[PDB]
Structure formats: C-alpha cells, structure tokens
C-alpha cells in the first residue's frame, strides 16, 4: 500500500539508504540493547511512544521469523534449500530489522531530530568519494 | 523480551484466543478493508494513532514475507520445499497477521472498548453449548 | 525466592550481563581495592550505606566459599572431583562475586547513576562497530 | 578482612554464641517465615532496611550454594565426594545461614533491642546450671 515505516517518524527509506550494512550492529546486539534499556517499557501496557510501539511490532515479527527458520530446519529434507531460506531470512530480513531497530533505539536515546541530522551528515559523508572525504565517519554516541 | 502486541491496546493473546482461527477473515479481505478505509492515513506522515503505527508495521512485514515467498518460488528448486515454505508462511503467519489486522482495523472502526467487549461476548457465545447457543453470533456494527 | 541483588540499587542481572565476562577485574584485585579504600568502613559498626552492607555480606560469603575450597582440598580424595569443585567455585561464583564487587565498589567510588550510565554506554560501545564508535573504550576516572 | 556481619546492627558472633547451635530453626522453616512475612519487601526495589539488604544477599548466596549442590550431584560420579560436599554445605553453611536468618527475621519482627535483650537473657538462662534453671526459657513473642 506504499507505506514507509519511517515517514511517520520524519525519515525515509532513501535517507537510511546510505547507511552501509557494516554500520548496523547484529540482531542479537540490538535486541540486547533494547532488552537492557527499554525492556520494562516494551513489556508495559502503556503506549509509551510510537518508537516503543514499532519496536514491539518488529520484535514480534522477528520472533515469528525465527520460528519459521526453526520450522524449516526441522521440516525440510533438502539441506540446500533449507540453508538457502535461512540465509535469506537472516541476511536480508535482519539487515532491514537492524535498520529499524537502530533507527528507533537511536531516536529514543538521542532524539528524532538529532538522528535525522546525523543521517543527513552521514549521507553527505558517504556520498563523497574517499579521496575527498575525511577518513573518520560521523559518530552518534552518548560519550 | 516476552512482548504481547495487544497489551498496550488493552487485550492479550489469551483474550483473543476466545476467537477461533476459522473466524478471522482473509488477508485479502482485511487488506482491501484497510485500503478502502484508511489508505490516506496509513500513507500519512503522522502518528494518527498507535493502531495506525502497528498496522503500518504489520503491513510492511507482510510485504516482506510476500517478497520472501516470491524469492523462494524463484530460487528454490525442490518443489516440495518451495510449496512447504509458501504454505507455512501463508497459513500460519497470515493467521497471525489477520488476527492483528482484524484487531486494529476493528478498533480504528468501532472502538478499542467495543472490540474488547466484543471479545468477551464472543467468548460467552462460543463457550455456550450449542443446544442453547443462538445462531446469531455476535458481530460488530455501526448501526 | 525471586530476588535480584541489584534492583534496590537500580540495576539488574540483565544490565550487568550487558557487559562481557572478560571485563570484570579479578577477585584479588577487587578485594585489594575494597580493603585499601573502605576497610575501616566495612569493619565499622555503622550502616554507612547499603553498598557497604551488601559488600560485607558478599565478602563473608566468599570467605565461607574459600573455607569450603580448602576443606575440599583436604578431605576429598578424588583429585578429579576436587579440581572440578574448586574450578566451578572460582569460575562461576568468582564471576558473580566480582561482578557484584565491581558494581558496589565502583558505585561507592564514582556514583550509582554514573556506574549505570557506564554499563549502558560500554555495552552499546562494545556492540557498535569500530569504524563508527569512538576508538577508545570507556573507563571510570576520579581524576 | 575481619568483617563481622552483625556489628553493623549491634551484635557480634560472640553474642550469638550464647545460643547453642541446636537452637536455630531449619532453613526450610526460616525461609518459609520470610516468604510469609517479608516476601514483597525483599522482592521490592527499595532499601526498606539494612536487615532486608542483608537477608537478600544471604538468600542469593544460599541459592548459589544450592546450584552448586545440584551441579555436584550431576557432574560428580563419585558418590563419596558428592555426599561429603553436599553434607558439608547443608550442615556448616546451613548453620551459619540459619543463624543469620534467625537474627534478621527476629530483628524485623521484634527489633534489634528486643533481640539483643533476648540474647542476654537466654545467655543467663543457659549459663545457669539446670538445678537452678527455670523451665520457662525466654521465648520471643508479641503476646
Ligand atoms: C535487504 O535489506 C536492505 C535494506 O533495506 C532496504 C529498504 O529498507 C526498508 C526497510 O523496510 C523494513 C521492512 C520491514 C521491517 C520489519 C520491522 C517488518 C522486519 C522484518 C524485515 C524482519 C520483516 C523493517 C524494515
Ligand atoms: C499460527 O498462529 C497461531 C495463532 O496466533 C497466536 C497469536 O500469537 C501472538 C502473535 O500474533 C501476531 C500477530 C501478527 C503479527 C504480525 C503483524 C507481525 C505479522 C506476521 C504474523 C506476518 C509476522 C505477529 C504476531
Ligand atoms: C559451622 O557454623 C559455625 C557457627 O558459628 C558461626 C561463626 O561464623 C559466623 C557466621 O558468619 C556467616 C558467614 C556467612 C553467612 C552467609 C549469609 C554469607 C551465608 C552462607 C553461610 C550460606 C555462606 C552467614 C554467616
Ligand atoms: C557464571 O555466572 C554467570 C553470571 O551470573 C550472572 C549473575 O547471576 C545472578 C547472581 O548474582 C550474584 C552475584 C554475586 C553473588 C555473591 C556476592 C553473593 C557471591 C557468590 C557468587 C560467591 C555467591 C551472588 C549472586
């Protein structure tokens, strides 16, 4: 239905299109970050924020995908296709899942405005060729 | 994190378990409804409601699952494994997807409170033995 | 029962597992620190702080564990079983003990809130990729 | 270091030595008493009292020792060593644990002052030879 999961929050798939894949932590790392920083709120009966809502939904999706992967490994007799499906799920879907988790966690942490500014600046940086861009990328940190 | 996607909305997997699985409409039907009634709001850059947020996330996840099914039908060779994966995706993941779509669309349309009352009333109905179970099952209506 | 030795201090086993196990100093190092810095207060007849109380209890428990290990070395004959017991103690219970000692000493020294923020920040740091995190690991300092 | 876990509260190991070792109720009984009277306070995120702070740590230590005992019963195939270790734990560590539990549960139920007066009076009673010792020993009570 031509839905962008970030347009509601002030971003776009094209704005995060520039962040490389090596930029995002692993799924386990991001899920641990969430479970340690906002678990009491995600497991809460309150609409603490749209970021919380989206995180809840995406975590449920990922749980269902892991269930799918287990079911595949248990019910498919062709190892080739089994590993192919599992690899597609992990690589692609987890890349998207990392994108979304990072966006929402970083927003909850720093600010939606700050994260969008960081995205703009990081796009400026990554579009520049290495011969003319500084070697050290921009950094979003609590320290 | 053990997250319930309805806890914030005032329900639970136990309160929706009152409804059978053969109750929820088709994914096609629910998506047509969602389009016809809230396309401009779901495509909007606004947190119109947590229901809208959750519904957007669910729809993007279903789109990714359809992409997975297509990628499977293309790449995978073993017809048994292809059909197994596609049928599992559709049946199970779409059962859950329709559950969620029904909940959120019905809420947006009638009321979260109305939908929870409908859940308890349908529980009463389905628990009533057939000898005394009226045929006029409960149904949501604006009239 | 379901007791967390950290919740009164505003932390959790989930938050202290958010840091690696190879990060926490040795039992000897932490006990030397505790002595040098708070021996007169831990050997005092005052509830100087809940940190002091918990640390006293932990140290007495570790002393009883050391007595157990010596008693094992003496009485037990099977060297395999003896070594296995002593190793279990000094590894598992040692890790737990030094996590707790680190928490409480670092709190007494820098601040409970400072230490919790440090846990969060160091976890996010060691989970973030190097090219996009600051290059130097976080550390607590009174200087 | 030389830490007495009672002088923080107003007692010593020499004062509680007035009571014999066969005086203290079993770990089962004392843990049931605690679960009955102060479960919600021990499981609370509050420094309700130093007695709570100490009892929490003691119970955590006891849980770790029980884990050790089960791990022993599993991984050790020398019944002699298994039994030796489990018996040592449940006897010596059990005695110390139930001393501490008695002290703290009593000081929570009655008070530091009442419990110390009780210790002194019971010392009188027990140092008194039996030919001149009343049968109605001192017995803590609110009635
Ligand atoms: C292979 O991925 C490359 C990066 O993605 C490019 C387009 O980005 C759009 C991302 O859109 C989504 C879609 C779905 C999702 C959810 C939360 C539903 C999770 C998923 C991918 C596990 C189904 C997240 C982001
Ligand atoms: C196989 O279904 C069993 C019945 O469902 C039990 C309910 O389980 C709770 C989780 O429900 C959902 C519902 C929807 C979803 C979304 C919207 C993310 C879509 C899905 C199922 C395509 C991943 C996820 C979990
Ligand atoms: C065999 O028992 C001797 C009785 O005399 C006790 C002398 O020592 C004082 C008791 O000190 C402790 C030490 C540790 C503990 C804790 C709470 C840590 C529990 C334990 C014994 C399970 C480790 C309690 C009391
Ligand atoms: C191998 O351990 C895995 C990591 O454990 C995570 C923490 O588990 C919760 C238990 O936490 C503690 C911490 C310290 C302690 C004390 C200080 C009482 C010491 C000990 C371990 C000797 C009993 C007890 C429990």
Residue numbers in the entry:
A (entry chain B), B (entry chain A), C (entry chain C), D (entry chain D): 1 to 143
The authors write:
Intrigued by the changes in the rotamer conformation of Phe-97, we revisited the mutant HBc-F97L, which is a naturally occurring variant with an immature secretion phenotype. In an earlier study the side chain of Leu-97 was in the same position as Phe-97 in “conformation 2” of the TX100 bound state of wt HBc-CLPs. However, this earlier study also identified a pocket factor with an L-shaped EM-density similar to the hydrophobic head group of TX100. Thus, we suspected that this earlier map represents HBc-F97L in a TX100 bound state, which is plausible as TX100 was used during cell lysis.
The envelope with the surface proteins surrounds an icosahedral capsid that is formed by 240 copies of the core protein (HBc). The building block of the capsids are dimers of HBc, which consist of an N-terminal alpha-helical assembly domain and a largely unstructured C-terminal domain (CTD). While the ARD is projecting towards the capsid interior, the NTD forms the capsid shell with protruding dimeric spikes that contact the membranous envelope. Instead, most of the mutations with a secretion phenotype map to a hydrophobic pocket in the center of the spikes below the SS-bridge in the rigid part of the assembly domain.
